[PDB]
Amino acid sequence: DNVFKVIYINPGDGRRKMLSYSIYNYLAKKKYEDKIVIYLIEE
């Protein structure tokens, strides 16, 4: 857990999913510089 950080993504509507992508990419850019980030996107 000191190496890999896993971000699992599973989803009015439409823009909330893109806003969740912006939140997940902002958290991966900010809080996870020292980790290897693996995205797991489900549909």
Partner: protein
């Protein structure tokens, strides 16, 4: 029996829209454009599981309650002699049709807000003329639609 038209006034992102229809309808468009809000205007008109909760403040156009919500659906009944769904309509609405060969029918919804109760009541009407809609009879939680 055929769907002909729907007219939506002051419901969510629709200020005044008029859409001709049919039996088979396919709705498409962009994101945040109102495809789900178009289908929920049919849910408030015809489905009794949503109509019993009433309207909130957020169901009004740009959130102000000084304008009433009016949704009118038009049906065509020109094939009464061949279709059984037309007789399924006419056997419940046996008093409100005006002329002897009335081929149109109108099912309408009106809603006016109450600021003290903070509640939006839904009143439904039907008939054959647009200026002579009568109230739907009902007893308890069941009306005739």
């Amino acid at each position: 029996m055929k769907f002909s038209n729907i007219t939506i006034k002051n419901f969510r992102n629709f200020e005044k829209v008029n859409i001709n229809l049919d039996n088979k309808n396919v709705i498409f468009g962009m994101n945040d454009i109102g495809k789900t809000n178009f289908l929920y205007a049919l849910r408030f008109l015809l489905d009794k599981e949503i109509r019993k909760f009433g309207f909130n403040k957020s169901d009004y156009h740009k959130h102000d309650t000084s304008k009433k919500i009016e949704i009118i659906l038009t049906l065509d009944l020109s094939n009464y002699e061949k279709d059984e769904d037309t007789k399924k309509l006419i056997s419940v609405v046996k008093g409100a049709r005006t002329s002897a060969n009335a081929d149109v029918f109108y099912i309408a919804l009106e809603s006016k807000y109450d600021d003290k109760e903070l509640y939006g009541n839904i009143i439904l009407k039907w008939g054959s003329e647009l200026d002579n809609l009568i109230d739907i009879p009902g007893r308890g939680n069941i009306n005739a639609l």
